[PDB]
């Protein structure tokens, strides 16, 4: 079925299903992705009241739900049909031998291992010799294998647990990775259009393996930082949404070393998102577009002493030549 859903009249960011997002303030609505023919159903739920005695600041937040393809607008209301999740069976289920049907459930892994995936491949994709493709090719389309390959790279960025932290459901795992990668707006839109979670995981791995360089979105070619310098100082990952004194949301990716930037002014500590670090506005050395801030440790014992926080909207992932 389809739904008659209202439109958010002041939304800028595109919301991914399963992403919580503070908003710039001036029960299910629609958030379009204007290039302009797609969008996502967001849920404004927040009645949040923090408790600081006498002041209960009220923060508003939205969370993505279902994808859709817009049909027609009418002022704002939008009639839209929800795009389904295309869940596919195993690649070997078509050619699974009846004798090997019983020996298809594998015992669990002693989580710490790298040699376990060798026997995992030999067993799961054994009937590949019945087809015209090798064992390792089918692994490139195995959601469980793709998830571990993505999880391996994410552990190099964030130093957080590997258990319940990341969802096991591939359609949820795919949407989670989409909201964590430091990718531009058109890439998030391209991932939303993807129907199959396996394709979404394959492309998220492609983005990580190809789009290593992050550059200014305005002037295109101006390498700001690379994927190697990405690290996580905030316990909630390497890229978390912060709100400034006036209510502007900044999905700030923290990197060790950033280049080709100009500093505007002297370090300040007012409303610093990272306690104990003095922020200073950073701009592109070619087009003077705001890329982010530079944080310098006030005390000398802090580690790391200096790092950079780049806003996601000002970056453009590119593939080095």
């Amino acid at each position: 079925s389809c739904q008659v859903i209202p439109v958010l009249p002041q939304v800028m960011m595109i919301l991914i299903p399963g992403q919580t997002l503070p908003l710039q303030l001036f029960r299910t609505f629609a958030v379009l992705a204007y290039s302009a023919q797609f969008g996502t159903t967001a849920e404004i739920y927040a009645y949040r009241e923090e408790q600081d005695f006498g002041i209960e600041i009220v923060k508003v937040k939205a969370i993505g739900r279902q994808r859709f393809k817009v049909l027609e607008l009418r002022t704002q209301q939008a009639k839209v049909q929800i795009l389904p999740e295309c869940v596919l069976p195993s690649t070997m289920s078509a050619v699974q031998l009846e004798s090997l049907n019983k020996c298809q459930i594998f015992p669990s892994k002693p989580v710490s291992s790298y040699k376990w995936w060798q026997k995992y491949q030999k067993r799961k994709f054994h009937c590949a010799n019945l087809t015209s493709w090798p064992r390792w090719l089918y692994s490139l389309y195995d959601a469980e294998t793709l998830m571990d390959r993505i999880k391996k790279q994410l552990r190099e960025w964030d130093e957080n647990l590997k258990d319940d932290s990341l969802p096991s459901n591939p359609i949820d795992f795919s949407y989670r990775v989409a909201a964590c990668l430091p990718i531009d707006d058109v890439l998030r839109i391209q991932l939303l259009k993807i129907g199959s979670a396996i394709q979404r995981l394959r492309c998220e791995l492609d983005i990580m393996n190809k789009c290593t360089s992050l550059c200014c979105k305005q002037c295109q070619e101006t390498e700001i930082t690379t994927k190697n310098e990405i690290f996580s100082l905030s316990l909630c990952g390497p890229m978390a949404a912060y709100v400034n004194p006036h209510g502007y949301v900044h999905e700030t990716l923290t990197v060790y070393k950033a280049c080709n930037l100009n500093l505007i002014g002297r370090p300040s500590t007012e409303h610093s998102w990272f306690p104990g670090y003095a922020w200073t506005v950073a701009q592109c050395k070619i087009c003077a577009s705001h890329i982010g801030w530079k944080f310098t440790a006030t005390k000398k014992d802090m580690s790391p002493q200096k790092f950079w926080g780049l806003t996601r909207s000002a970056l453009l992932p590119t593939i080095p030549d």
Binding site: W279, V281, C287, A288
Partner: peptide, 26 residues
């Protein structure tokens, strides 16, 4: 003074010097 950018917090000492920065946000 209050001639700072509301989006990033860049401190400019002139009224015009901040209006030029406002273009670098859109």
């Amino acid at each position: 003074s209050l001639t700072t950018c509301e989006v990033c917090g860049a401190c400019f000492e002139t009224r015009k010097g901040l209006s030029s920065h406002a273009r670098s946000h859109l």
